[PDB]
Amino acid sequence: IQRTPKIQVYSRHPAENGKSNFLNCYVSGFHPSDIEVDLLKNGERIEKVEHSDLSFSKDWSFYLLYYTEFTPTEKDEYACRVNHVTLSQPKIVKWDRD
Amino acid sequence: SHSLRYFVTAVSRPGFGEPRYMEVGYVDNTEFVRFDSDAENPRYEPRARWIEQEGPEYWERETRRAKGNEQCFRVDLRTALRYYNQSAGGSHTLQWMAGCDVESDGRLLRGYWQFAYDGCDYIALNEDLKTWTAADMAAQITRRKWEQAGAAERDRAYLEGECVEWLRRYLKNGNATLLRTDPPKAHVTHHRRPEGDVTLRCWALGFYPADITLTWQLELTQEMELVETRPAGDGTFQKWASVVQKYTCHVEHEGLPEPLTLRWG
Amino acid sequence: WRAVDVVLDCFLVKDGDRARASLVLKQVPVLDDFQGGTLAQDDPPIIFEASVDLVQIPQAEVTCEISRYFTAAWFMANVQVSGGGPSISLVMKTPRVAKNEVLWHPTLNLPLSPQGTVRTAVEFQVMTQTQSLSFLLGSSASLDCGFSMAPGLDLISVEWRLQHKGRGQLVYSWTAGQGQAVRKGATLEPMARDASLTLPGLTIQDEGTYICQITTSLYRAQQIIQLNIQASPKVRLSLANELPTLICDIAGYYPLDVVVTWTREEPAQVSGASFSSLRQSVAGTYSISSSLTAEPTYTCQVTHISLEEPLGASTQV
């Protein structure tokens, strides 16, 4: 049995454009493990993030978390693109700063 | 309300000789002693800062454990493909989990020792702790054979003895941990979605441990709407619950005799 | 007519393998020197089976399997029809071993009757008529589990136990005179004996692989049924950001693989829409919306494991 991933994109802090914080795309509950995750800003992939080592949950379904330290603004939209093997088209999600 | 769990995973890399073998240990949902085969000069390496206080015997003895459990799975994957005629070029996974859950009072709560293949359960140790339960025809024979061998008594020995003493060693030795004590600053936000599709969102952020209960009432049942617990980058966790005019957000957390009471402030 | 000789050949694997055999069912009630390698003359008297209508199969996937259950010898074979078919497990007892007739090759065993067959009778079996069953969230399901037992070798206990999400729990259990249920009270309420389980208002917790285990006098065999649960999703569409944006919300659906595209009318099957963060409901049913931007007459079709249903809202200026 293969399990489509669960995707939650969010920030560490409530988003008010003023100072610096850190954002994270959290993907959990997927199987198998062939998971390709990218952080996108305004449609273009962010170059170098931190790809954490793979972690296993009690339900055989793995979970990964990608994150960056940056300063958010009010004129840019951010998103997370994931292309597991269970879905035929790469899914993209928008971070809702609200 | 505490637990120690060992997660072991073997992945079939086609066209590449060495199958990927990985192990990760956990106290509750806190990671430690992560182990990998694709690391420079491979051995057991400690992730947590508090585990680094263990002796070298842990690393040499335990790394021998990893070697045994690794060559074992190496021999076992060819057994999987020898029982199942499947295209060798395909990538398959076999996972092995073994952990013990103990309560804060010291009494043993429950113990788990289970094995799955390619996302489908294969064999597991029953709640009786003396009988196995197999999920497919292939694991039937493994279950009967393991029954005659009586693996349940040795596994019960490990889960009731060594693993509990270790769990007390990790929770007792490193006492500075678990002091974030889940102190969430929960407040509710509100917008107006068009056509009145709006929802009130109670937010509990920055807490730790992860076990927590969000509620809403005057909404007590079939109402609200929530997400799965998500870890924040700070090492904390966060959560929110939305409801579709006196509405209250009550939260069960770790704190002084006080749940939570919140309306539109 | 009624009297029918069944011949089902499969393989034989026992470790401690690669050995193809051929199981024979002597005579069974039925309503309306080639091949070989190895073969066992199995008869089913003193024990009856329910359907036994698996004949005239469009062969030109029945997968049987034998395994020795360790004087007389003992075996267990499980025949599994692939697709929408039955699934049987059964135990075979050999006649008592004598110091006179000693024949078999290899592995130095007995007896291979003068007809070149083992010639043994089945004594106990466990059959299911359903293998994978799919229901809705609030529905109520019956996962049948029948079993047959010859006179003697009487029952002892029957346990319903499930495995799902990694962990497993015992649902039901019985003894010689009474039994117990966990959570929802799901009784069964009955040589052909029945233990068909009926579950009431199902839950997401109820999704998983159910296992019907039987322990008797010297024999313990079991069968498995699969239970998958799905929930019909609710549909909605909204508009905001005014300039403008559209939110095609999807709510209360299970499982997780839902695919969503769009069409722009005067078709154009406008491919390219963004999702949002994933959410769900207390019971466990998921929900997510995929936002979009409009320009001035639309459609947000939805595809799930359940069947398809489209809807669209126009776009004025």
Curated annotation (Swiss-Prot), chain A:
UniProt keyword annotation of Signal present: yes
Disulphide bridges: C25-C80
Secreted is among the record's keywords: yes
Listed GO MF terms: identical protein binding; MHC class II protein complex binding; peptide antigen binding; protein homodimerization activity; structural molecule activity
Principal localisation: secreted
Superkingdom of the organism of origin: Eukaryota
Function: Component of the class I major histocompatibility complex (MHC). Involved in the presentation of peptide antigens to the immune system. Exogenously applied M.tuberculosis EsxA or EsxA-EsxB (or EsxA expressed in host) binds B2M and decreases its export to the cell surface (total protein levels do not change), probably leading to defects in class I antigen presentation.
Known partners and oligomeric status: Heterodimer of an alpha chain and a beta chain. Beta-2-microglobulin is the beta-chain of major histocompatibility complex class I molecules. Polymers of beta 2-microglobulin can be found in tissues from patients on long-term hemodialysis. B2M alone (not in complex with HLA-I) interacts with M.tuberculosis EsxA (ESAT-6) and an EsxA-EsxB (CFP-10) complex; the tripartite complex can be detected in the host endoplasmic reticulum. The B2M-EsxA complex can be detected in patients with pleural tuberculosis and is stable from pH 4.0 to 8.0 and in the presence of 2M NaCl.
Protein name: Beta-2-microglobulin
Native organism: Homo sapiens
Full-protein positions shown: 21 to 118 of 119
Swiss-Prot record, chain B:
Glycosylation sites: N85, N175
Chain intervals for the UniProt region annotation (Alpha-1): 1-89
GO biological process, alphabetically ordered: antigen processing and presentation of endogenous peptide antigen via MHC class I via ER pathway, TAP-dependent; negative regulation of neuron projection development; positive regulation of T cell mediated cytotoxicity; T cell mediated cytotoxicity
Cystine bridges: C100-C163, C202-C249
Membrane topology, record value: Single-pass type I membrane protein
Spans annotated as Alpha-2: 90-181
Keywords of the record: Disulfide bond, Glycoprotein, Immunity, Membrane, MHC I, Phosphoprotein, Signal, Transmembrane, Transmembrane helix
Family: Belongs to the MHC class I family.
Protein name: H-2 class I histocompatibility antigen, D-D alpha chain
